[PDB]
Design an enzyme around this catalytic site. Structure first.
Site, PDB file in Angstrom:
ATOM      1  N   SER A   1      -6.483   0.944   0.353  1.00 59.95           N
ATOM      2  CA  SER A   1      -5.390   0.037   0.120  1.00 59.95           C
ATOM      3  C   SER A   1      -5.483  -1.102   1.124  1.00 59.95           C
ATOM      4  O   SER A   1      -5.642  -0.866   2.323  1.00 59.95           O
ATOM      5  CB  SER A   1      -4.059   0.762   0.286  1.00 59.95           C
ATOM      6  OG  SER A   1      -3.012  -0.180   0.520  1.00 59.95           O
ATOM      7  N   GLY A   2      -5.357  -2.332   0.643  1.00 57.11           N
ATOM      8  CA  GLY A   2      -5.455  -3.462   1.542  1.00 57.11           C
ATOM      9  C   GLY A   2      -6.895  -3.941   1.775  1.00 57.11           C
ATOM     10  O   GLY A   2      -7.094  -4.955   2.436  1.00 57.11           O
TER      11      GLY A   2
ATOM     12  N   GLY B   1      -8.203   4.351  -4.729  1.00 54.59           N
ATOM     13  CA  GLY B   1      -9.232   5.345  -4.507  1.00 54.59           C
ATOM     14  C   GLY B   1      -8.651   6.675  -4.073  1.00 54.59           C
ATOM     15  O   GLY B   1      -7.432   6.844  -3.990  1.00 54.59           O
TER      16      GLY B   1
ATOM     17  N   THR C   1      -7.614  -6.104  -5.445  1.00 54.05           N
ATOM     18  CA  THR C   1      -6.858  -6.988  -6.309  1.00 54.05           C
ATOM     19  C   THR C   1      -7.222  -8.485  -6.164  1.00 54.05           C
ATOM     20  O   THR C   1      -7.383  -9.174  -7.172  1.00 54.05           O
ATOM     21  CB  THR C   1      -5.333  -6.708  -6.108  1.00 54.05           C
ATOM     22  OG1 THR C   1      -5.030  -5.412  -6.652  1.00 54.05           O
ATOM     23  CG2 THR C   1      -4.480  -7.770  -6.758  1.00 54.05           C
TER      24      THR C   1
ATOM     25  N   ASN D   1      -0.505  -2.705   3.013  1.00 48.01           N
ATOM     26  CA  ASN D   1      -0.700  -3.961   2.307  1.00 48.01           C
ATOM     27  C   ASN D   1       0.622  -4.594   1.844  1.00 48.01           C
ATOM     28  O   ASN D   1       1.373  -3.991   1.060  1.00 48.01           O
ATOM     29  CB  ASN D   1      -1.626  -3.644   1.119  1.00 48.01           C
ATOM     30  CG  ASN D   1      -1.932  -4.832   0.259  1.00 48.01           C
ATOM     31  OD1 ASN D   1      -1.428  -5.911   0.499  1.00 48.01           O
ATOM     32  ND2 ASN D   1      -2.766  -4.635  -0.769  1.00 48.01           N
TER      33      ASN D   1
ATOM     34  N   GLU E   1      -7.411   9.762  -1.880  1.00 52.53           N
ATOM     35  CA  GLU E   1      -6.570   9.711  -0.695  1.00 52.53           C
ATOM     36  C   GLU E   1      -5.983  11.072  -0.278  1.00 52.53           C
ATOM     37  O   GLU E   1      -5.556  11.861  -1.117  1.00 52.53           O
ATOM     38  CB  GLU E   1      -5.447   8.694  -0.913  1.00 52.53           C
TER      39      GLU E   1
ATOM     40  N   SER F   1       0.744  -4.456  -2.056  1.00 53.93           N
ATOM     41  CA  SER F   1       0.092  -3.271  -2.614  1.00 53.93           C
ATOM     42  C   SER F   1       0.319  -2.994  -4.117  1.00 53.93           C
ATOM     43  O   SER F   1       1.460  -2.965  -4.585  1.00 53.93           O
ATOM     44  CB  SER F   1       0.502  -2.013  -1.801  1.00 53.93           C
ATOM     45  OG  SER F   1      -0.151  -0.832  -2.287  1.00 53.93           O
ATOM     46  N   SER F   2      -0.770  -2.772  -4.844  1.00 57.55           N
ATOM     47  CA  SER F   2      -0.717  -2.444  -6.276  1.00 57.55           C
ATOM     48  C   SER F   2      -0.193  -1.004  -6.447  1.00 57.55           C
ATOM     49  O   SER F   2      -0.819  -0.066  -5.960  1.00 57.55           O
ATOM     50  CB  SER F   2      -2.116  -2.535  -6.904  1.00 57.55           C
ATOM     51  OG  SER F   2      -2.662  -3.826  -6.766  1.00 57.55           O
TER      52      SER F   2
HETATM   53  N1  LIG Z   1     -10.756 -12.553  -0.354  1.00 55.67           N
HETATM   54  C1  LIG Z   1      -9.572 -12.640   0.228  1.00 55.67           C
HETATM   55  N2  LIG Z   1      -9.073 -13.861   0.611  1.00 55.67           N
HETATM   56  C2  LIG Z   1      -7.875 -13.916   1.202  1.00 55.67           C
HETATM   57  N3  LIG Z   1      -7.035 -12.914   1.496  1.00 55.67           N
HETATM   58  C3  LIG Z   1      -7.569 -11.678   1.083  1.00 55.67           C
HETATM   59  C4  LIG Z   1      -8.781 -11.473   0.472  1.00 55.67           C
HETATM   60  N4  LIG Z   1      -9.010 -10.124   0.212  1.00 55.67           N
HETATM   61  C5  LIG Z   1      -7.925  -9.574   0.646  1.00 55.67           C
HETATM   62  N5  LIG Z   1      -7.011 -10.461   1.223  1.00 55.67           N
HETATM   63  C6  LIG Z   1      -5.733 -10.174   1.962  1.00 55.67           C
HETATM   64  O1  LIG Z   1      -5.513  -8.745   2.051  1.00 55.67           O
HETATM   65  C7  LIG Z   1      -4.359  -8.316   1.267  1.00 55.67           C
HETATM   66  C8  LIG Z   1      -4.665  -7.038   0.652  1.00 55.67           C
HETATM   67  O2  LIG Z   1      -5.582  -7.235  -0.484  1.00 55.67           O
HETATM   68  P1  LIG Z   1      -5.548  -6.646  -1.798  1.00 55.67           P
HETATM   69  O3  LIG Z   1      -6.501  -7.332  -2.655  1.00 55.67           O
HETATM   70  O4  LIG Z   1      -4.191  -6.759  -2.309  1.00 55.67           O
HETATM   71  O5  LIG Z   1      -5.969  -5.159  -1.555  1.00 55.67           O
HETATM   72  P2  LIG Z   1      -5.954  -3.910  -2.479  1.00 55.67           P
HETATM   73  O6  LIG Z   1      -5.630  -4.259  -3.852  1.00 55.67           O
HETATM   74  O7  LIG Z   1      -7.325  -3.510  -2.234  1.00 55.67           O
HETATM   75  O8  LIG Z   1      -5.010  -2.769  -1.998  1.00 55.67           O
HETATM   76  C9  LIG Z   1      -4.100  -9.500   0.353  1.00 55.67           C
HETATM   77  O9  LIG Z   1      -2.720  -9.492   0.029  1.00 55.67           O
HETATM   78  C10 LIG Z   1      -4.519 -10.661   1.222  1.00 55.67           C
HETATM   79  O10 LIG Z   1      -3.534 -11.083   2.170  1.00 55.67           O
HETATM   80  F1  BEF Z   2      -4.827  -0.389  -2.894  1.00 58.92           F
HETATM   81 BE1  BEF Z   2      -4.053  -1.746  -2.702  1.00 58.92          BE
HETATM   82  F2  BEF Z   2      -2.802  -1.550  -1.853  1.00 58.92           F
HETATM   83  F3  BEF Z   2      -3.699  -2.290  -4.095  1.00 58.92           F
HETATM   84 MG   LIG Z   3      -3.937  -3.951  -5.163  1.00 61.89          MG
END
Ligand SMILES: Nc1ncnc2c1ncn2[C@@H]1O[C@H](COP(=O)(O)OP(=O)(O)O)[C@@H](O)[C@H]1O
Ligand code: BEF
Ligand SMILES: [Mg+2]
Ligand SMILES: [Ca+2]
Ligand SMILES: [Mg+2]
Lengths: 793, 139, 154
Positions: free
Chosen positions: A176-177, A445, A181, A227, A447, A230-231
């Site tokens: 996560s984070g 993923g 996304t 995050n 956890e 977070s999704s």
């Molecule tokens: N390529 C990127 N450019 C800018 N900020 C990013 C990037 N990848 C991640 N982030 C930062 O990290 C945060 C977490 O990313 P995110 O894509 O939402 O993670 P996940 O979906 O993997 O849990 C985003 O809200 C953003 O602030």
């Molecule tokens: F897994 Be991330 F917080 F969408």
């Molecule tokens: Mg996400």
């Protein structure tokens, strides 16, 4: 490779290894990596050796330390600095994969390859690498003729579809984070820009594909500790392409929306972003339409954790969510029905109650709920405090009621999100002719938390089927390496445990089915469920275990442990029955089914979470096994969301099980050279004086069963376990040889003393003999008389 | 035996009391009691029986000559001890030489040990084998 | 083994000498069973000797010649190290692969691995083979292995 100058477009993408190839020496036998508690691995130089204990000099501060010879990891030479594809380095171990990613990362380079894999390190800041000008430079390019970038994964997946004539999938994974996304959106955005069809109100298909995110993220994302965005749901998007190779249409599948967040938030978290949007006063006119007072900290259903989020302007995002519905082509009605229902949930959480049976402590709130839902408040209040089933009037108490309001809120939100997704799909389903598609998948993923429950079992189970998919495609990469080495592994054995864990969960006597059967019995409860699970699996399966000793403090209660691919997970089965089956008052349901509001009506118009998830999951796997996959491993660099900072133990951990060559039951392999230098000791007397023949004589020596290895043009392959056995014989062999040498030394020392031992035997015999004579003579009468007379002459 | 003989002749004439050229039972019984400590009347008979024939100086040397026959020279015996003194310090550690004589080769019983070290030259735990050799060989 | 006459004669000669040293009595102390065999040109491991009856201390068990012969024929069967076995083993400790190992490492291997040797035995063998280290304090293990395998009288 490629050509590119002082173009700003490449500032954060290219490595000018000659404005940086330009002043330090390196020696493979001396320079190496050693463990380091604060940086993962530290750069060192071997000073000396004393068996298994090596002394090194820590290059940073000159300090000295001791390290087990086995913990030393090979360092790559200066030439492979910030390499773009790590498959090309010499050493592909944790320590050097960690160095290569970190070097590029602190240099602003977040994208790096490693064979077919693309690694992305989360920046935590906005970069200038996603501009159309960059998208102009990546169009049509091979990965080798342009620096590493997410765009190339997408473009090449696109080039394949048109060339190989087959569907493609981009699975973007990570914690996560980590950035899944963000990256999923860049991929879609890229395809929408490079492949858009030829030529407020509804925008075109491409515009809608992108504008689906603001509405789904508004309803399915929330601030968590890891995050801020977070999704709380998994997503699979398919972009279909027509005859000319332009975007024909698209659809979206969502999985596992986190229902409990709707009424409960932990410390430092928030409910879905939408609620704070609805209370921001971004569009003052919709306030009276929603009957809300623009003060989020006023509602119980969303003011439990925090209210605001750094880097998130709810006022601004509401205007964006609002306009996104316009472009997706939602009527003013459909749209307002969405905001209306969302606002009802906010009021439901305000309905107070007083002290056997329960009663309303007022009605102002319920009138808001009922007004927004298109039903009479009194009807509602009644069907809540005393349900009339099938009538049969029941008597609810305080809690049963406040739990009934919570369940209505969740069932509403959930039915709404699914409605939203289907509505967005109606818009995206242009009936255009199509050929193939590119699907981008973004789910959470595996956890393991201190406390694991239903939600975790569902997520993990989805990952167990996914890992299997990834393992299937790894076996194909395996089978093509064989032929390239000219060998053949007729019979193997690689994925029985994975399938075994999956079967334990999804089969007709599995964990989910036992739950589905139990959820359709009004009298059943936690223990009732605990007994069927136990009778069917405890002591009857090795993947289903009894909880052991805490693996971490603050580790919550558990009832059984499930051996997943990524680790043992202790699960608790409390509340599982209510979780899988919606516990809403069928009486309050009836009223809503007859609401005045068209959306509410439809939302409750005359099939459990696990049941629903199985079908979704079966459909996803089916689509993926029909595609050529492209994997993207996202990785979070630290826990502080701080750009440029690297947390070693954190990054290493994420490199542990994802394909980056940094566990599988595949045959092991060694380049003859390393073999000969590691096992020539297993057969020293059969080595002449060609690493390849030296390797064959050793194996010929041990006379190993030919059905346990394979001759590689460049390396030898062994069946899982074999290499482990050779390592053991090696220990025994080396130890015994040393002993024979010590025995040889003892033989030299004793053979050196032999002569002196023979000389001295003669010496001692002379001494004992002549002392005995001198003694016997002294007792001889004659010698005595004689001794008495000698003094007198 | 060359320088010894003459000495064995003066002695012979001192044991032969009645001065007649023959040592008899009475000759011994008289000289013994004279210098003290005579043998038992049966022990005197043995001393003479060891010489099958009237005992004149010839038979005298004969019994002595044949008694001191067989032994090794002083140098040989001195060199036998030297084989256990690598430092060539001309001494042997008392514990070491006793160890050698009693627990090895043809082990000495406890009396042979007592009789051997009773007058053995020992100082500071060192056994003077060169002195002990001079002493065993008459000197 | 099919020992000849000459060899059983050599065995009897060695036994006799050894029977003399712990006191002549037609018996040889079992703690000396190993050294007897070394005198006869065999290089047995301690494990090999304890297995044919060797003991751990003087004054425990003694052996007449009849019982020795078998113990001997037994130790003749055990594996004897070759030149190539020793080089490969030392090669495992040679990082630079030049034929060098520091004096300290050599001492470590002999005193801490396999059937350990004592620091006096290592000092003794180093002096007897006249093994000396260069200015860095390293040695050529191949020469050392050669000196040991060649014996006290090369
Ligand atoms: N390529 C990127 N450019 C800018 N900020 C990013 C990037 N990848 C991640 N982030 C930062 O990290 C945060 C977490 O990313 P995110 O894509 O939402 O993670 P996940 O979906 O993997 O849990 C985003 O809200 C953003 O602030
Ligand atoms: F897994 Be991330 F917080 F969408
Ligand atoms: Mg996400
Ligand atoms: Ca003996
Ligand atoms: Mg007379």
């Amino acid at each position: 490779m490629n050509i590119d100058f002082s173009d700003p477009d490449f500032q954060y993408l290219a490595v000018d290894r000659k404005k940086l190839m330009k002043t330090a020496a390196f020696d493979g036998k001396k320079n190496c990596w050693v463990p380091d508690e604060k940086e993962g691995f530290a750069s060192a130089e071997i000073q000396s050796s004393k068996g298994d204990e090596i002394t090194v000099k820590i290059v940073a501060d000159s300090s000295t330390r001791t390290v087990k010879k086995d913990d030393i990891q090979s360092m790559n030479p200066p030439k492979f600095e910030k390499l773009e594809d790590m498959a090309n380095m010499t050493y592909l171990n944790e320590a050097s994969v960690l160095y290569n990613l970190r070097s590029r990362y602190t240099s602003g380079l977040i994208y790096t390859y490693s064979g077919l894999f693309c690694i992305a390190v989360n920046p935590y800041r906005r970069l200038p690498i996603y501009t159309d000008s960059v998208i102009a430079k990546y169009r049509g390019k091979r990965k080798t003729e342009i620096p590493p970038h997410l765009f190339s994964v997408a473009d090449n997946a696109y080039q394949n579809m048109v060339t190989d004539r087959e569907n493609q999938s981009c699975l973007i994974t990570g914690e996560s984070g980590a950035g899944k996304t963000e990256n999923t959106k860049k991929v879609i955005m890229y395809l929408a820009k490079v492949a858009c069809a030829v030529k407020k109100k509804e925008g075109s298909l491409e515009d809608q594909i992108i504008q689906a995110n603001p509405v789904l993220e508004a309803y399915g994302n929330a601030k968590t500790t890891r995050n801020n965005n977070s999704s709380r749901f998994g997503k699979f998007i398919r972009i279909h392409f027509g005859p000319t190779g332009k975007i024909a249409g698209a659809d979206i599948e969502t999985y596992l929306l986190e229902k409990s967040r709707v009424t409960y938030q932990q410390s430092a978290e928030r409910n879905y972003h939408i609620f704070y949007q609805i209370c921001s006063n971004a569009i003052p006119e919709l306030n009276d339409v929603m009957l809300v007072t623009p003060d989020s900290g006023l509602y119980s259903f969303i003011n439990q954790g925090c209210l605001t989020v750094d880097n998130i302007d709810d006022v601004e995002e509401f205007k964006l969510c609002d306009e996104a519905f316009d472009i997706l082509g939602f009527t003013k009605e459909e749209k307002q029905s969405m905001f209306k229902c969302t606002a009802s949930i906010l009021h439901m959480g305000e309905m107070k109650f007083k002290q056997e049976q329960a009663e309303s402590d007022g009605t102002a709130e319920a009138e808001k709920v009922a007004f927004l839902c298109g039903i009479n408040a009194g009807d509602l209040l009644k069907a809540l405090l005393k349900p009339k089933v099938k009538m049969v009037t029941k008597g609810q108490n305080m809690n049963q009621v406040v739990n009934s309001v919570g369940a209505l809120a969740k069932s509403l939100y959930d039915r709404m999100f699914n409605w939203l997704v289907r509505r967005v799909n109606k818009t995206l389903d242009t009936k255009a002719k199509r050929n193939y598609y590119i699907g981008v998948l973004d789910i959470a993923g595996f956890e393991i938390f201190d406390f694991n429950s239903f939600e975790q079992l569902c997520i993990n189970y989805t990952n167990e089927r996914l890992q299997q998919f990834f393992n299937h495609h790894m076996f194909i990469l395996e089978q093509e390496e064989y032929k390239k080495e000219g060998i053949a592994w007729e019979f193997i054995d690689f994925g029985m445990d994975l399938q075994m864990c999956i079967d334990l969960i999804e089969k007709p006597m599995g964990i989910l089915s036992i739950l589905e059967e139990e959820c359709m019995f009004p009298k059943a409860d936690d223990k009732s469920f605990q007994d069927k699970l136990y009778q069917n699996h405890m002591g009857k399966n090795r993947m289903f275990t009894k909880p052991g000793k805490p693996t971490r403090p603050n580790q919550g209660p558990a009832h059984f442990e499930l051996h997943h691919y990524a680790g043992n997970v202790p699960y608790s089965i409390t509340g599982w029955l209510e979780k899988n089956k919606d516990p809403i008052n069928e009486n309050v349901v009836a009223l809503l089914g007859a609401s005045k509001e068209p959306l509410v009506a439809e939302l409750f118009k005359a099939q459990t979470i696990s049941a629903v998830h199985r079908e979704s999951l079966n459909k996803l796997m089916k689509n993926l096994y029909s595609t050529h996959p492209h994997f993207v491993r996202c990785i979070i660099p630290n826990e502080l969301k701080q750009p440029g900072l690297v947390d070693a133990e954190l990054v290493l951990h994420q490199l542990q099980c994802n394909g980056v060559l940094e566990r599988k039951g595949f045959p092991s392999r060694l380049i003859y050279s390393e073999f000969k230098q590691r096992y020539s000791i297993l057969a020293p007397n059969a080595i002449p004086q060609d690493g390849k023949t030296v390797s064959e004589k050793i194996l010929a020596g041990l006379q190993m069963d030919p059905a346990e290895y394979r001759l590689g043009t460049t390396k030898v392959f062994f069946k899982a376990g074999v290499l482990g056995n050779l390592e053991e014989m090696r220990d025994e062999r080396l130890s015994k040889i040393i002993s024979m040498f010590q025995a040889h030394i003892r033989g030299y020392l004793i053979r050196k003393a032999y002569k002196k031992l023979q000389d001295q035997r003669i010496g001692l015999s002379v001494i004992q003999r002549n002392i005995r004579k001198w003694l016997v003579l002294r007792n001889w009468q004659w010698w005595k008389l004689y001794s008495k007379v000698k003094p007198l002459l | 035996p060359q320088k010894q003989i003459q000495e064995m002749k003066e002695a012979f004439s001192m044991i032969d009391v009645d001065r007649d050229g023959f040592v008899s039972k009475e000759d011994i019984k008289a000289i013994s009691e004279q210098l003290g400590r005579a043998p038992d009347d049966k022990e005197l008979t043995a001393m003479l029986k060891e010489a099958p024939g009237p005992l004149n100086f010839t038979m005298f040397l004969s019994i002595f000559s044949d008694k001191l026959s067989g032994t090794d020279s002083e140098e040989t015996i001195r060199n036998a001890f030297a084989m256990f003194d690598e430092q060539e310090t001309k001494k042997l550690n008392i514990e070491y030489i006793k160890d050698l004589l009693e627990n090895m080769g043809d082990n000495f019983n406890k009396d042979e040990m007592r009789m051997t070290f009773k007058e053995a030259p020992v100082e500071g735990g060192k056994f003077d084998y060169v002195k002990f050799t001079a002493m065993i060989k008459g000197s | 083994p099919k020992l000849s006459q000459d060899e059983i004669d050599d065995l009897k000669d060695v036994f006799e000498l050894f029977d003399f040293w712990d006191g002549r009595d037609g018996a040889v102390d079992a703690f000396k069973l190993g050294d007897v065999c070394r005198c006869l040109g065999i290089n047995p491991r301690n494990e090999d000797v304890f297995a044919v009856g060797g003991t751990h201390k003087m004054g425990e068990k003694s052996l007449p010649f009849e019982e020795f012969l078998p113990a001997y024929e037994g130790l003749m069967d055990c594996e004897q190290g070759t030149f190539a076995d020793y080089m490969e083993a030392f090669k495992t400790f040679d990082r630079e692969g030049q034929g060098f190992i520091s004096g300290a490492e050599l001492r470590h291997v002999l005193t801490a691995l396999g059937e350990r040797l004592s620091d006096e035995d290592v000092d003794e063998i180093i002096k007897l083979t006249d093994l000396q280290e260069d200015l860095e304090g390293n040695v050529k293990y191949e020469d050392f292995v050669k000196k040991v395998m060649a014996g006290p009288y090369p």
